[PDB]
Design a protein around this ligand. Structure first.
Ligand SMILES: Nc1ncnc2c1ncn2[C@@H]1O[C@H](COP(=O)(O)OP(=O)(O)O)[C@@H](O)[C@H]1O
Ligand SMILES: Nc1ncnc2c1ncn2[C@@H]1O[C@H](COP(=O)(O)OP(=O)(O)O)[C@@H](O)[C@H]1O
Lengths: 121, 237, 237, 121
């Protein structure tokens, strides 16, 4: 199975995204902040990272930046799933290496279509 | 005269949108998931996902009630109606109401009375409950980011002809310039330790007004990096 | 500067609370009913009740987006991105988007072009759709209360080196003193024909700003008891 | 069966209240506005009126006032179910003869408990 690293500070949010990813047969590893996420990459290499922006300890922008600075981390595709609704927010994330920015509130079925697209190229 | 700046009102509007968007995200994601997964949900999961919708709805409702109460304080329409209340019981009730929220942030909630209980007083129990909830909520919200021993503690005492309530935390603390402004409408400290924390800057304005309506006062002591103590003094009768 | 009175900001905060409380009420009532009635609920009704939760969530989302867009325009971070769009498709699309809401108020929504289609223009389709929906929404909200022939009509035309969109209704109309104020942030006409209608007074301020960002202008003609015509002129290229 | 007159301008709201009332075996007659509600009292005498405040054509405060002006209509109990969250709103409705004011958002199960209480006593 494909392995997805899910990074968000909300347990409620992680639970629903995890449910929807598991419906498709994907394995899911959860992190509650950006620093935890980068620490989990020492144990595995995910096929996809789903990343929030506004997190304590280490925010998503910092995560995306640090992801670009390691060779072994830089190629993992990242979908940013965020309440940050601005065009400038999105442009910053994409310029930091995100493959796709989806806004919250989101459609779980649209989100999973985009996940599949990134996992299958 | 010098008032509530337009930049602050703009930030406030942006902050309303952001704080409401989080429960709404959960409501819509959980509802759509149920609607599209009726064949893939066991009964305990179905019920758990419904309870999320309901509990996220209740959080959004509390955030609307803050806007409402604030509008109503700004028009003097908010009446206080006093009664004889055991504060020991009120405080324990408020501590209970916040327990789930504090757990989600690994914050222990404690209560000590410096005086034997009951501690009876002539107060509006609904309005004081709401003062206590605002302070307790802020102790959770502004708690340290990664610490093993985070707490918010309510200390009850009788002093100077009234009841003194202290809400103490070992959170982030408040810098000295910010201390004179935290009770102002729309004021939030904007720092690298607050950027992710949702809020409007109305809670301590409501709390200050409610306290003044009881003829009381509220003040703060804090040290950046150590924590904060909020003191609420209300006349006993 | 004479500016958005503190009275208007206070009314605004109250109006936010009120407009959000209606969808939230539905969300919570429908969710709790599902949770408590899982034995008495048929499948068709379960699905219908979930659809209500989802659709009320979507309405609430739109309301939050209005607040966000307004804060973004006030900070000047909202910035347009143009393309070549057929206005005829865009309008039809907007008309479709509002069908359910108009039906709910027995308002017929019409579209006429004075010019044959396509009608190409160099515009941001997202932001012009949102102008059209604000005007279409307002034509439904401020429609007559009890009348058999209520309508909102979009009229497309090419004029003065640009495209002229007229949104016409046979609603309640706007009083002459209000006409010069309706585009202001937070302004709502307060009358016996508007007391129940939800809103914040942001929509036409957003619309005005989006139109002016496109180098266009928006104006109004109205008569009380008869209806209103909103004119939006935007340069062709 | 007890008959309930349901007065609210929202079809979505009426539907969910109607569902919960019909679960208890009550009959439900609906009215979209205050004037419609008073017109339907020429056809029947409900055992309970569930009444909103903010409605076009005729608001619930006018409805409550007009209900006290006719002896037949004046003893029908009324629960006001409203978004009007003020103490002064509530006092006004009770002074106009409502039996109970319940706020929106509401709990369907708490609402039904109060309906049953009023229908029996
Ligand atoms: N216990 C606390 N510790 C640290 N900062 C706090 C505490 N309580 C309040 N604050 C600060 O005071 C500000 C105002 O608080 P409040 O009026 O409750 O608004 P909000 O919580 O929506 O920001 C908060 O933004 C925060 O900067
Ligand atoms: N089509 C219309 N007919 C009558 N009045 C309207 C119309 N559109 C707008 N208005 C008036 O203009 C005011 C401002 O409208 P808008 O900015 O869209 O705010 P809102 O709809 O939230 O009140 C409305 O409150 C209403 O009084």
């Amino acid at each position: 199975s494909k392995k997805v690293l899910l990074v968000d500070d909300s347990a409620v949010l992680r639970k629903i995204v995890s449910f929807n990813l598991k419906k498709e047969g994907y394995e899911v590893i959860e992190a509650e902040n950006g620093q935890i996420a980068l620490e989990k990459l020492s144990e595995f290499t995910p096929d996809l990272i789903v990343l929030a922006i506004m997190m304590p300890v280490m925010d998503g922008f910092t995560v995306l930046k640090k992801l670009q600075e390691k060779e072994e981390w830089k190629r993992i595709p990242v979908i940013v799933l965020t309440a940050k609704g601005g065009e400038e927010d999105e442009s910053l994330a994409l310029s930091l290496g995100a493959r796709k920015v989806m806004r919250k509130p989101f459609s779980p079925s649209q989100f999973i279509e985009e996940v599949k697209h990134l996992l299958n190229e | 005269r010098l008032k509530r700046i337009d930049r602050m009102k703009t930030e406030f509007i942006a902050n309303i949108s952001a704080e409401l968007r989080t429960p709404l995200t959960a409501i819509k994601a959980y509802a759509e998931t149920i609607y599209n997964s009726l064949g893939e949900l066991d009964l305990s999961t179905l019920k758990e996902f419904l309870e999320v919708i309901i509990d996220q709805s209740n959080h959004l409702e509390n955030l609307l009630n803050e806007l409402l109460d604030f509008s109503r304080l700004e028009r003097k329409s908010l009446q206080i109606n006093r009664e004889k209340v055991d504060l020991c019981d009120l405080v324990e009730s408020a501590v209970n109401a916040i327990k789930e929220f504090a757990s989600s942030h690994n914050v222990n909630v404690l209560f000590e009375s410096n005086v034997p209980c009951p501690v009876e007083a002539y107060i509006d129990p609904t309005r004081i409950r709401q003062v206590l909830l605002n302070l307790l909520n802020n102790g959770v919200k502004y708690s340290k980011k990664d610490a093993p021993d985070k707490y918010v503690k309510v200390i009850l005492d009788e002093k100077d002809g009234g009841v003194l309530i202290i809400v103490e935390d070992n959170g982030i603390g408040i810098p000295d310039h910010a201390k004179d402004r935290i009770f102002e409408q729309f004021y939030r400290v904007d720092s690298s330790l607050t950027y992710e924390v949702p809020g409007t800057g109305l809670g301590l304005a409501i709390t200050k007004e409610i306290v003044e309506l009881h003829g009381g006062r509220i003040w703060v002591e804090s040290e950046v990096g150590k924590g904060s103590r909020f003191f609420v003094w209300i006349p006993k009768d």
